[PDB]
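Email to the structure team, subject: Tyrosine-protein phosphatase non-receptor type 1 model.

Hi all, the expression group asked for a predicted structure before they design truncation constructs. Nothing fancy, just the tokens so they can compare against earlier work. One-line instruction: predict Tyrosine-protein phosphatase non-receptor type 1, return tokens.
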Amino acid sequence: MEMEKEFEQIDKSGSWAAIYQDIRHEASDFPCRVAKLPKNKNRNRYRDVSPFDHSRIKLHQEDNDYINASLIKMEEAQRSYILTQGPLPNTCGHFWEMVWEQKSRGVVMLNRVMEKGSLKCAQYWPQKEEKEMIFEDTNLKLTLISEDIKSYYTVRQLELENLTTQETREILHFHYTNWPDQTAPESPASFLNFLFKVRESGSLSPEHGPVVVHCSAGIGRSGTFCLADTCLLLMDKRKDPSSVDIKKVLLEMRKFRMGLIQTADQLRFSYLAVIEGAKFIMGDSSVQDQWKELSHED
Ligand SMILES: [Mg+2]
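Reply from the structure team: attached below.
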């Protein structure tokens, strides 16, 4: 409600760049001494994007415990996410180890492997059923079980086997294929249709570990997805949208991972997605079918 009024005022004032910037000036600053250790240089995709020491995910095999990943633990919303960079050729083992050790059930991928003529993420999951991936270092096996390709996202069913214990888990892979970096999605509708497929799958249930979310750096598009979901869940818990302050939620998220939400436009989009998603949250069940038609999944 008041979230809507604020939105109209920022737009009628053009002050999104200012609003976004003072968010950056206010954002938490914590050390990342582990990420900056020389032995970990080749484990970071971007020199300037590192996990805080206090919230980083530790790998459990006791050689080197480092992976570029953060646990976003939203206390009030009672949802946790793991935000991580797109795996590098040499960290795909670590990535699936993290998935196993943290008991995650879903992976949300918000980037493509090639973006703007460069490799922004490694090909970390198998593309054909008959060629499984085995990660020798971490003792994990990854089979592609099935794949549902929609117009602007793809959902995949993967089998992850701990080759040590021979225990196997189903991992759901949710892959937004439509979303270039630094831009907002085309409409909130396709974005929300995707967020709500993730929600409906149970991958966000507290019975499982934290969902793993990544783009290339794991802050821009990944932060957009996480902020929208948490704001929606918050106003759902109170059934009082009036009381959700998106900026204060973003700044709480930024206590756990630097740089979440990378442009002013992504901030403005987050407002749009939450305002629109709240129509559903507050009892208009049929707006979800209405998002599905404007998404044009073919
Ligand atoms: Mg891009």
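The longest helix spans residues 220-238. Residues 115-116, 180-181 surround magnesium ion (CB under 6 Å). Ping us if the truncation boundaries need rechecking.
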